[PDB]
Ligand binder design. Structure first.
Ligand SMILES: Nc1ccn([C@@H]2O[C@H](CO)[C@@H](OP(=O)(O)O)[C@H]2O)c(=O)n1
Ligand SMILES: Nc1ccn([C@@H]2O[C@H](CO)[C@@H](OP(=O)(O)O)[C@H]2O)c(=O)n1
Ligand SMILES: [Cl-]
Ligand SMILES: [Cl-]
Ligand SMILES: [Cl-]
Ligand SMILES: [Cl-]
Ligand SMILES: [Cl-]
Ligand code: NA
Ligand code: NA
Length: 124
């Protein structure tokens, strides 16, 4: 029973490194954030910025979300991110991920009081 904000933190924050440094980053991180317990989660983005910087996006550029909701926000600046996406060789329980490191703007959906990120919509 995890709050939406806490789930976003676990799935999407990696403030301890500046960037992925190896092809095995996603395999490691998907496992240790408990994203491969029951199934291999197919796609998951990690953000290599402070939690404060990611939370601050909720006051930045208001944009539509993919699903048409209007509580999404696009970061004014690019951020260091890693996209983790399952390869064709991936088969639970032996999940396998491609690591793609990039510097891009993030789009998050925000909710609550405090008004914080609860969904990762996209990177641009
Ligand atoms: N893959 C994961 C890992 C944790 N969690 C949530 O985070 C909680 C653990 O802090 C989980 O509670 P359960 O252990 O009751 O499933 C679950 O609510 C999740 O929903 N999916
Ligand atoms: N670019 C993307 C697209 C999807 N996703 C993940 O895949 C899920 C469903 O598409 C998303 O749910 P949340 O936005 O609730 O975190 C997110 O965890 C991602 O992390 N990065
Ligand atoms: Cl930090
Ligand atoms: Cl912080
Ligand atoms: Cl804010
Ligand atoms: Cl505007
Ligand atoms: Cl922009
Ligand atoms: Na773990
Ligand atoms: Na931080």
């Amino acid at each position: 029973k995890e709050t939406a904000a806490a789930k976003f933190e676990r799935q999407h924050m990696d403030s301890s490194t500046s960037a992925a440094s190896s092809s095995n980053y996603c395999n490691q991180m998907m496992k240790s954030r408990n994203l491969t317990k029951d199934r291999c989660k197919p796609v998951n983005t990690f953000v290599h910025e402070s939690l404060a910087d990611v939370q601050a996006v909720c006051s930045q550029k208001n944009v539509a979300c993919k699903n048409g909701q209007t509580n999404c926000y696009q970061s004014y600046s690019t951020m260091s991110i890693t996209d983790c996406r399952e390869t064709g060789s991936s088969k639970y329980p032996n999940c396998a991920y491609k690591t793609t490191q990039a510097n891009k703007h993030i789009i998050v959906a925000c909710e609550g009081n405090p008004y914080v990120p609860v969904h990762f919509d996209a990177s641009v």
